[PDB]
Amino acid sequence: MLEAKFEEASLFKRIIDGFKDCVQLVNFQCKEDGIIAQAVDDSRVLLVSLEIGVEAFQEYRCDHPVTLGMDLTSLSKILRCGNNTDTLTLIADNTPDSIILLFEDTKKDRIAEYSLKLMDIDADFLKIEELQYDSTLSLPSSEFSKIVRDLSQLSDSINIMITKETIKFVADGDIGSSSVIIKPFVDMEHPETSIKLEMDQPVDLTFGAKYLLDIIKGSSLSDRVGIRLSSEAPALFQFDLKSGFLQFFLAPKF
């Protein structure tokens, strides 16, 4: 009925990581064009949205829509058992109470099979994404990961501000302060180091550093990170998949 085969289990593992620090109970809607998942934290400042396209799997077959409500902790326990390089195949016949996970390795000499029991998770799906954001911005995820990791040393809240040609991060907690200033540049070897900034309106927003910290563990899925900011809206942090993405919508501090 449903058969999704990841070329490498690391992918699913990493996706599930991006979620697990933010919530435990998540519905995975599987359909003909792939899988989506949406989940909010308890404070409802952070919404995590995932979409995994068909071409993102080595092989993918879903006969008809089916929801897989899962406990992220239980799931990650099971994922602990396979390794980053195993092929992972999720499988379910329709109207399921549980799914199956298949790791193989091609030496040789491995083929482990587990079965997770599904739960019923009550979900009211949200479509809060805006048409355009005041500023759009991309950069190496590794770089953004450091800026966050660093600045979250001084303050429990980080302030991001965009003016013409300047992106600026600032943490100013009791103990001390730091300010990173970066700017748009293309660098051809390679251009995945480059920093892109499109600004309609300048924006000056502040976020809980604790959540930014969650958001940047998606760095493992993508060389780069996209960031859309608006004055009156949750910020959108995005890591592109081969086909799809993991996105984090995060409420600016009032």
Describe this structure in words.
The protein has helices at 9-20, 72-79, 141-151, 209-215; strands at residues 2-6, 25-31, 34-40, 46-53, 59-62, 66-71, 87-92, 98-104, 111-117, 135-140, 157-163, 166-172, 177-182, 196-199, 203-208, 224-230, 233-241, 244-250. The chain has 254 residues and is mainly β. The chain has a single domain (1-254), classed as Box (Proliferating Cell Nuclear Antigen), CATH 3.70.10.10. Strand 12 (166-172) and strand 13 form a beta hairpin. It is globular, with a radius of gyration of 19 Å.
Main traits of this protein?
globular; mainly beta; 254 residues; monomer; Proliferating Cell Nuclear Antigen; replication; five-stranded antiparallel sheet; nine-stranded antiparallel sheet; DNA binding; 18 strands
- Helix share of residues? 10-25%
Rg, nearest Å: 19 Å
Beta-strand content estimate: over 45%
Q: Topology as H/E string? A: EHEEEEEHEEEEHEEEEEHEEE
Q: Which of globular, elongated, flat, extended, rod-shaped describes the shape?
A: globular
Order of strands, widest sheet = 6-2-3-4-18-17-16-10-14
- CATH topology heading: Proliferating Cell Nuclear Antigen
InterPro entries: DNA_clamp_sf (IPR046938), Pr_cel_nuc_antig (IPR000730), Pr_cel_nuc_antig_C (IPR022649), Pr_cel_nuc_antig_CS (IPR022659), Pr_cel_nuc_antig_N (IPR022648)
Pfam families: PCNA_C, PCNA_N
Cross-link (Glycyl lysine isopeptide (Lys-Gly) (interchain with G-Cter in SUMO)): 127, 164
Protein name: Proliferating cell nuclear antigen
In short:
The protein has 254 residues and is mainly beta.
